């Protein structure tokens, strides 16, 4: 399963 | 930007036997950027039902793909892979040699 937390942009 | 030309291997899944079903592979690797055109050829013509793997990449960030089709080799037929990429002036054709 893929990362399941909050997404963060560069 | 960084541009890397594809490495190409053309080979069968199993030892070639005339008149026996097999799989023809064209493995392209080491290239960047990802856009690439790959065809498998039979006596110079594009084979229709060629499939390919999903785009992935290596430790150096270069991409790799496998293109393949079922085929039945014979003595008279010749096979090849034809690749085009931004790093090539014209399509690069690599002949299938059964011994390698």
């Amino acid at each position: 399963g893929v990362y399941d937390g909050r997404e963060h942009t560069v | 930007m960084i541009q890397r030309t594809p490495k190409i291997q053309v080979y069968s899944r199993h030892p070639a036997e005339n008149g026996k079903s097999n799989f023809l592979n064209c493995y392209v690797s080491g290239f960047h950027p990802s856009d690439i055109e790959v065809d498998l050829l039979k006596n110079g013509e594009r084979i229709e039902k060629v499939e390919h793997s999903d785009l992935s990449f290596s430790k150096d960030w270069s991409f790799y793909l496998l293109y393949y089709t079922e085929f039945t080799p014979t003595e008279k037929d010749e096979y090849a892979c034809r690749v085009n990429h931004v790093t090539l002036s014209q399509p690069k054709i690599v002949k299938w040699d059964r011994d390698m």
């Binding site: 963060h8 942009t9 | 899944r13 990449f57």
Partner: protein, 275 residues
Amino acid sequence: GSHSMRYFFTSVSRPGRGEPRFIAVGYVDDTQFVRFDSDAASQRMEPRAPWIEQEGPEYWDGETRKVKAHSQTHRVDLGTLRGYYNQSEAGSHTVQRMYGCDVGSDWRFLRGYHQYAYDGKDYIALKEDLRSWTAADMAAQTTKHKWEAAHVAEQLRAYLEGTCVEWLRRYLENGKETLQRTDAPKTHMTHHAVSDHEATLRCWALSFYPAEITLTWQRDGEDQTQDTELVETRPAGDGTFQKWAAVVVPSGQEQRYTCHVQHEGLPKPLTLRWE
């Protein structure tokens, strides 16, 4: 006895029209098990291995939601990075991201990793401890500072040391028949004359899994790299891999030469000799 779960993401901008092309693939070891392609009609994460088809609709719904969110992050990043690098809106650019976790033979967390590239070059990566970042250039220092402020490492570490390992252990069990089986190479040697006085010996390793392998020629017991040739390890197409190594020798002296094969599926390395 260690195993890994890894995800690979590639986004490529399309400056002439529309949003980036986005491809995601997941692997356990050298086995692909899932994919997402923005160019496909389903717009869903899709199975690529039989053992993951055991998962029910809630799995596919959640993976789809999360992977589409990853795609949006990359879309934003491509726009941001164009500005960081003062680039034109006319070219196509690429973001790549890989992350994953390993378990050891004890089935416990071993290591985690998270790497990001822009235009095929290192951009930013988690350090080995999963608590700090390696920025490759001054652009990436912006990202590092932004991520440090938002405690991004801790969030990633939570997944890599937790959920990531739990998924891997589930997959390993569900897919045990293949994911935890090694396929030792099927090896053989060929011989053919290249003149009346020389011959080529070619050592083949076929149908092996995982991909890591070593093929080495020796002459009278010591490593021979001169007068040898090889191919890079390549996929057979059925989930296994292939490789060969060859040496040219004087005809009649074949028996001096040995091909040594090391692979994790072999309890001891194999030594092959011609007739």
